[PDB]
Ligand binder design. Structure first.
Ligand SMILES: Cc1ncc(COP(=O)(O)O)c(/C=[NH+]/[C@@H]2CONC2=O)c1O
Ligand SMILES: Cc1ncc(COP(=O)(O)O)c(C[NH2+]c2conc2O)c1O
Ligand SMILES: [Ca+2]
Ligand SMILES: [Cl-]
Ligand SMILES: [Cl-]
Lengths: 371, 371
C-alpha cells in the first residue's frame, strides 16, 4: 500500500477497559460518530462492545443506520438531526433518538404514529454549551409534552443528556456548574411527574478526571481511540490506536544549494539525501506541517523539508544511507517506537488531536490490527 | 445536511478559457486527487466534452479508476511507487511517465511479460528536484529508449517537466526552467530521439506564460476555476465548487452567554445564532473558527466560537431575523452571490485554495449541477 492508517483494535479494547475502570458502576456509551473519529465506526463499535461497552453514541441517524446495516444490534443513540429528517427509519431500526426541541419531539411523535413504533427517547438539554439542546425556559413544556406522550405509550422516556463545555479542563468550575444545572433539570422533571431511566453528562475528560460528576452513563469518545482527553497530564494510561505510515517512494541525492518543492522554500546547506513520501495535504497531511513535522524511518527522526504538496512531501535523510526505497516511515502513532504522536501534530499545527485523526484519507488506506 | 456542488457548466467554461490561452496546444486536464476534490470521473467527462484532449493523473490506480468508469480518452500517470507492476497500466491503455532509469527498466520488464507496447512519457527534472530524470541520466535514457523504440517495445509519446513557481510567472526561474526543458528537447534531437509532444505548462504557465507553451498544456487548478495566480484575480475563470449546508437551528442568545467549547466567544449583545451542522471532520478547518464568514440569504454571517468536529455556530446579528431552519448557508463558492471564495479560506488560515477544495468530505456530499 502507498500509505495506511493502521487502527490497533487491541489498543481500542485496552482503552475501553481503562475507561470502564474510571466509570465505576456507570454504563459506558462509546461515541463512534464521524466514522469512529476516523478509525472506523463499525470495527471500533464491535471491539468496544466486546470490551464491556453497553451502548453506542453517534451524532446522526444516518451514522446509526450504518452501524445497524453492519449487523450491530447493541443500543445506539443519535443526537443531531437536521431539519426535514424522517425519524421513521430510525424507529424501524431500533435507533434511540435524542430530541433538543419541541418541534423535534412533535416530528418524532408523527413518525411514531406513521410507523406504529414507540420511540425510545432521550432529551438533550442545554447546561452551558448553548448549541442544540433544549433551553431552560423551554424545558417545562418539553417535560409536559413528553409526559402526555408517555401516558399514551407513544414514547419510552429513556434518557436525559447534556454535553460538557470543556473537553479538556476538568478543574474549571463550569464543569461543576453544568453538573448542578443537570441536577436541577432532573429536579424539574420530578416536579413535572417525569422520571428518566438514565441521565448522562460526561465525555472522555469528565469520565477520567471528574468521576465525582458522573451520573448514570458516561459517553467517552476521544479516549476510546487512545488520545489523551487532558493532554497536559500525559497519556493517562491510554494507547493511541491509530498509526499513520507510508512507504518511501524515492530516495534522491541533492547537492548543497539546491532547492526543494514549490517556491524552493528550503535550500540544502549540505550534500544530503531526501526521501519522497507519497502522501500530502489531499491525504490529510496538513500543509501547515511543511518544514515542521518529523517522521520516523528505521528508528531515526527525519525532518520534513520544503512545502507539503497535494500528495507528496520530502524528508531529510542526512548524508551512507540506512533508508531504502520501500522502507516504512511512521508519521504518527501512540509513540511506542519513538514516532511522533497525533498530539505532536496538533501542537505543530495549533489544533487538537481530534482534528488530526479525522484527517487521514485518500492515499492513506485505513487498516486494522486485531486484538 | 451539506454539499460540495460542482458546477459542470463552470468546468466547461474554464476548459474553454484554458483552450483559448493554450492556442494551438492541446489540453491535458489534470484530475488527480479525485479531481482535486471535484470528482475525477465527472470532471474528466465534462472536460473531454468541452474539448480537453487527454487526462493527467498521478497514479496508475487513478487512471484505472477512470478506465473502470468508462473513460476511453488518453490518460497519463506520472507517480509510481518502487517495484510497481506496470502490467495493469499497459493492458488498460494507461500512458506511463517514467522519472528514472530504474523505473524505465520496470516498465520494459512489464512490456516483456505482457507483450504490449508502452506509450511512454519521460518526466525530466528542470529544477523541481522532486522526482524527474536529471540531465546526468538523460543521455543514457535516450540511448535505451531508442533501442526499445526500434523493437516497438515503447512508443515515445511525450517529454514533460513541472514548473517550480509558475504562480510567480514573472520570476526568472520560469524562463530558466523553460530553457532547461528546451535543452532536454535539444539533447534528444541531437541523439536522434524524437518525442511526439513536449509539455511543461501547468495552469499558471498556461494562463500567464503562453510564451512557454509547447505542444500540450497540463492545467489542474484552473480547470476547477481556481486562480493559478491569485494575485492577478480570477483570470476570467469561475470556481466550480460551492460548499453549502442547511441551517440546522436558529436561536436567540443573551449578552454574556458563551458559545461552543471553552466559551471562547462571549456574546457582547443579545443576538441570533445559526447552527451549521458541518465541522472539521468534514473539512471545515478548525483554524477557521472565529475568522470565517458564511453567506445566508445574501448577508455575511461570521463564525463565532470554536469549530467542532461536525458543527459550528454563526452570528446572524440582532437585526430582523431573516434566516430560518432549512435555509442555505454558503461557506465558499465562485463569489457570484457575494459568498466567500476558496481563496478567502486560504488567506484566513495561511494555505492555498488547492488544499481548501481537497478538504470537504464527510457530511459534505459531492453533488453536480449539469452544464
Ligand atoms: C453529545 C456528545 N457526547 C459525547 C461526545 C464525546 O466527547 P469526547 O469524549 O471528548 O470525544 C461528543 C463529541 N463531541 C465532538 C468531539 O469534537 N467536537 C465535538 O463536538 C458529543 O457530542
Ligand atoms: C506533473 C503535474 N502536472 C500538472 C499539474 C497541475 O498543476 P496545477 O495546474 O497547478 O493544478 C500537477 C499538479 N501540481 C501540484 C499542485 O499541488 N500539488 C501538486 O503535486 C502536476 O503534478
Ligand atoms: Ca427557507
Ligand atoms: Cl504526487
Ligand atoms: Cl455534530
Amino acid at each position: 500500500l502507498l500509505a495506511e492508517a493502521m487502527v490497533d483494535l487491541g489498543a481500542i479494547e485496552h482503552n475501553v477497559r481503562v475507561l470502564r475502570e474510571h466509570a465505576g458502576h456507570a454504563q459506558l456509551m462509546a461515541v463512534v460518530k464521524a466514522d469512529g473519529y476516523g478509525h472506523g465506526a463499525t470495527r471500533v463499535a464491535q471491539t468496544a462492545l466486546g470490551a464491556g461497552a453497553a451502548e453506542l453514541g453517534v451524532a446522526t441517524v444516518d451514522e446509526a443506520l450504518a452501524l445497524r446495516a453492519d449487523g450491530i444490534t447493541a443500543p445506539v443513540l443519535a443526537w443531531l438531526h437536521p431539519p426535514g429528517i424522517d425519524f421513521g427509519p430510525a424507529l424501524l431500526a431500533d435507533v434511540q433518538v435524542a430530541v433538543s426541541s419541541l418541534r423535534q419531539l412533535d416530528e418524532l411523535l408523527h413518525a411514531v404514529r406513521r410507523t406504529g413504533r414507540t420511540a425510545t427517547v432521550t432529551v438533550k438539554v442545554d447546561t452551558g454549551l448553548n448549541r442544540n439542546g433544549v433551553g431552560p425556559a423551554q424545558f417545562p413544556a418539553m417535560l409536559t409534552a413528553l409526559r402526555q406522550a408517555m401516558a399514551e405509550d407513544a414514547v419510552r422516556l429513556r434518557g436525559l443528556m447534556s454535553h460538557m463545555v470543556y473537553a479538556d479542563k476538568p478543574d474549571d468550575s463550569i464543569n461543576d456548574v453544568q453538573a448542578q444545572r443537570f441536577t436541577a433539570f432532573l429536579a424539574q422533571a420530578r416536579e413535572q411527574g417525569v422520571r428518566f431511566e438514565v441521565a448522562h453528562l460526561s465525555n472522555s475528560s469528565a469520565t477520567m478526571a471528574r468521576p465525582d460528576l458522573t451520573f448514570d452513563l458516561v459517553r467517552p469518545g476521544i479516549a476510546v481511540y487512545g488520545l489523551s482527553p487532558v493532554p497536559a497530564l500525559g497519556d493517562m494510561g491510554l494507547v493511541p490506536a491509530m498509526t499513520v505510515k507510508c512507504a518511501v517512494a524515492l530516495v534522491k541525492s541533492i547537492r548543497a544549494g539546491e532547492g526543494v518543492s514549490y517556491g524552493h522554500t528550503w535550500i540544502a546547506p549540505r550534500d544530503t539525501n531526501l526521501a519522497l513520501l507519497p502522501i500530502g495535504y489531499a491525504d490529510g497531511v496538513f500543509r501547515s506541517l511543511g518544514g515542521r513535522l518529523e517522521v520516523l524511518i528505521n528508528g531515526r527522526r527525519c525532518p520534513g523539508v520544503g512545502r507539503i504538496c497535494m500528495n507528496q512531501f520530502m524528508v531529510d535523510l542526512g548524508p551512507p544511507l540506512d533508508v531504502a526505497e520501500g522502507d516504512e516511515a511512521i508519521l504518527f502513532g501512540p509513540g511506542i517506537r519513538g514516532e511522533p504522536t497525533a498530539q505532536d501534530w496538533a501542537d505543530l499545527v495549533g489544533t487538537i488531536h481530534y482534528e488530526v485523526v479525522t484527517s487521514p484519507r485518500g492515499r492513506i488506506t485505513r487498516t486494522y490490527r486485531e486484538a
